[PDB]
Amino acid sequence: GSKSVLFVCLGNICRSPIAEAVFRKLVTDEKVSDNWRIDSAATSTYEVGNPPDYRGQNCMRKHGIHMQHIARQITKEDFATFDYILCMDESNLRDLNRKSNQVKNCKAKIELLGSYDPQKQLIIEDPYYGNDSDFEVVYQQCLRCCKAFLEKT
Amino acid sequence: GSKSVLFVCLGNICRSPIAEAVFRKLVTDEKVSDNWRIDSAATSTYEVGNPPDYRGQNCMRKHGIHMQHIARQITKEDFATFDYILCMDESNLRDLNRKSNQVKNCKAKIELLGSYDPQKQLIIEDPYYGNDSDFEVVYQQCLRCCKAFLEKT
């Protein structure tokens, strides 16, 4: 069998590439990667066509994650092929709740990734205008949430 | 001004990610990578959410290629935004020509990547059912074809 999770942010160059990479690493360490199809996408068209933010790549290198992405925009079909859509902030939740109420098939559950954080830090905030530490913060949030999310399966 | 190309195969884990990263390298070598939007996608949905075949991931690693991809399916809007859709085999071509006539706005020129081969190896066979040498052959094909394609424009 297979479960499916799509991590969504605004641009798909900082947060969601990291969440994707952290969840893939986490299901590889647990030896469950055979049963997970994992992707990430953007709500907007700003950064489609681009690689991850280098601060994110270097943050992922720091934890031995082989991040591997080209930014893409979320589609209509993603709401049908993915069991969970996990986003970063209320703004993503707002936009995705709109498009979910305007689609021919909506299998996905649309939730905040931060809603799984044991520490209850609800928002994973865009680190694009921060420094390398803002990216490490996001990686810690993603790891905490991704572990809870996995636990509850 | 800015140009763009989409590399398409069946699942987007074997040939097309290689072609994608090969082309991305040799536009960077030519110092024209600012003027290119580069990506790859699948005709089907089976492999969506997977990283590239680890064999190909090894092939790229052996030629110093930074492959960074998760599989995605081609979309309506890919046909509208991409200047080129270069595919691998007649099945891709067949399926892409049909979808191209089924969208309201098709910018993309759909060709076989192999049609650019100076050696005239027109089909880039799927290496999925073979070994590491089958990925080396696809690489060398993508290398020939991408060069000749960039030299066209």
Side-chain angles (χ1 to χ4, degrees):
Chain A
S2 248
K3 274 147 281 175
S4 59
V5 62
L6 179 66
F7 293 100
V8 191
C9 60
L10 171 66
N12 193 228
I13 51 158
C14 305
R15 283 164 299 171
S16 57
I18 292 167
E20 176 190 75
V22 169
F23 186 75
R24 181 164 273 102
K25 189 83 201 305
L26 181 52
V27 300
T28 302
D29 292 341
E30 306 276 309
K31 311 296 161 209
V32 188
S33 73
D34 288 354
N35 299 324
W36 282 96
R37 84 202 305 96
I38 312 156
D39 203 355
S40 59
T43 45
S44 79
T45 57
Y46 289 135
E47 299 284 317
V48 299
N50 292 317
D53 191 280
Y54 292 81
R55 291 165 289 172
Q57 287 173 38
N58 292 314
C59 178
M60 289 312 94
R61 206 75 52 256
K62 212 153 293 192
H63 307 95
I65 325 297
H66 293 258
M67 177 151 60
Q68 45 191 349
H69 208 63
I70 298 287
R72 80 181 178 80
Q73 190 178 18
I74 192 170
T75 75
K76 298 196 173 192
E77 291 70 37
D78 292 336
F79 291 89
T81 71
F82 281 104
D83 293 290
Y84 287 91
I85 280 178
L86 297 184
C87 60
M88 309 303 162
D89 54 42
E90 292 290 349
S91 244
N92 301 137
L93 190 65
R94 176 178 311 113
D95 302 12
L96 298 162
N97 288 339
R98 192 190 59 241
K99 263 156 145 177
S100 71
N101 303 323
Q102 302 284 54
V103 275
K104 191 141 181 153
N105 320 263
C106 187
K107 170 170 93 163
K109 306 313 192 74
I110 293 170
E111 306 176 317
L112 283 165
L113 177 53
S115 74
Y116 288 83
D117 180 23
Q119 293 190 38
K120 304 250 210 191
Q121 196 143 314
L122 190 54
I123 317 303
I124 301 171
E125 276 290 338
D126 189 350
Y128 175 69
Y129 305 103
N131 57 349
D132 287 277
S133 43
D134 294 278
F135 278 84
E136 182 68 15
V137 164
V138 167
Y139 163 86
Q140 291 300 316
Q141 292 187 264
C142 284
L143 183 71
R144 289 198 310 266
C145 303
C146 283
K147 283 177 157 183
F149 181 79
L150 198 54
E151 225 153 271
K152 315 201 191 195
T153 301
Chain B
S2 65
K3 299 144 189 180
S4 68
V5 57
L6 182 73
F7 296 98
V8 176
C9 67
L10 167 63
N12 193 226
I13 55 154
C14 296
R15 297 163 283 182
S16 44
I18 292 164
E20 187 194 342
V22 170
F23 190 69
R24 179 169 298 105
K25 170 139 205 300
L26 74 89
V27 299
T28 304
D29 295 350
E30 293 285 350
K31 311 304 183 220
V32 189
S33 70
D34 266 26
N35 279 265
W36 278 97
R37 174 162 162 267
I38 299 165
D39 202 347
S40 57
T43 55
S44 99
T45 57
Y46 202 89
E47 312 293 335
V48 71
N50 299 340
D53 198 282
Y54 291 9
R55 288 167 301 175
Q57 220 156 317
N58 249 13
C59 186
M60 293 314 92
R61 183 184 66 88
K62 311 233 162 153
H63 302 269
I65 299 301
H66 306 307
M67 191 154 65
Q68 35 190 333
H69 205 67
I70 297 290
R72 77 171 180 80
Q73 195 184 25
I74 192 169
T75 62
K76 248 190 286 150
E77 295 71 22
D78 288 331
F79 289 95
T81 60
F82 278 98
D83 296 310
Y84 292 92
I85 294 172
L86 304 172
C87 61
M88 306 302 161
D89 58 42
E90 288 279 4
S91 301
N92 316 133
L93 181 64
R94 175 192 203 175
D95 304 344
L96 289 164
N97 286 322
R98 291 182 57 103
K99 280 183 213 252
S100 82
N101 290 272
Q102 289 170 340
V103 302
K104 93 162 282 188
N105 257 306
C106 179
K107 177 167 67 150
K109 187 158 150 276
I110 290 129
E111 300 178 297
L112 290 161
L113 181 47
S115 63
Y116 289 96
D117 191 355
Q119 299 183 19
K120 304 267 183 157
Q121 314 308 311
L122 184 62
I123 307 304
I124 296 161
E125 328 284 351
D126 187 11
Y128 185 81
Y129 321 103
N131 57 328
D132 290 72
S133 67
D134 283 284
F135 286 73
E136 184 64 17
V137 172
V138 169
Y139 170 83
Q140 298 293 334
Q141 287 184 282
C142 293
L143 178 55
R144 270 131 57 201
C145 295
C146 286
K147 284 181 175 168
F149 169 76
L150 185 63
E151 190 173 291
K152 164 177 177 69
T153 280

